[PDB]
A paper describes a structure:
The Phox homology (PX) domain was first identified in the NADPH phagocyte oxidase complex subunits p40phox and p47phox, and has since been found in proteins in every eukaryotic species from yeast to human. Despite relatively low overall sequence homology, PX domains all possess the same core fold, consisting of three antiparallel β-strands (β1-β3), followed by three α-helices (α1–α3). An extended sequence traverses the protein between helices α1 and α2, termed the PPK loop as it generally contains a conserved ΨPxxPxK motif (Ψ = large aliphatic amino acids V, I, L, and M). Side chains of residues from the β3 strand, α1 helix and PPK loop together form a binding pocket for the headgroup of the canonical lipid PtdIns3P.
We have also obtained two crystal structures of SGK3 and SNX23 (for which previous structures exist), as well as a crystal structure of SNX15, the crystal structure of SNX32 (in complex with a peptide from the bacterial IncE peptide) and the NMR structure of SNX25. The remaining PX domains all bind to a broader range of di- and tri-phosphorylated phosphoinositides. These interactions are shown to arise from the presence of a secondary binding site, centered on a semi-conserved His or Tyr side chain in the α1 helix, associated with nearby positively charged basic side-chains. Interestingly, many of these PX domains show a substantial preference for PtdIns(3,4)P2 (e.g., SNX1, SNX2, SNX22, SGK3, and p47phox), although the functional role of this is not yet clear from our work.
Author numbering: 6 to 119
Amino acid sequence: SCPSVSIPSSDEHREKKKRFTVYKVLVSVGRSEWFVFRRYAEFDKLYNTLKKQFPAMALKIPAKRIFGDNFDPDFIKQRRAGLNEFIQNLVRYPELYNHPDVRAFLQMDSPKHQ
């Protein structure tokens, strides 16, 4: 079927002198569903790759460079919203959800999903 996606939540991880937010993406294709876990940088690489290959789609992603606390929960919430709208637009077009970089991002061809 035509895939459906959402980004319901995010989680903070830390290592030493370091933190990062991990976005939980629910991906549904047909009668099945799974979880993909993506950092903003992973959305961004995809956005940059596809904005060049599909200019007229006027792809939009939330801001990359933040002047302020990039771990403000208000900020992360707005960012998640923007990323959700980003990917949810991606899966509307078969030109996109048959794109290899998109299918890998959402793990649409992993053998683990049967």
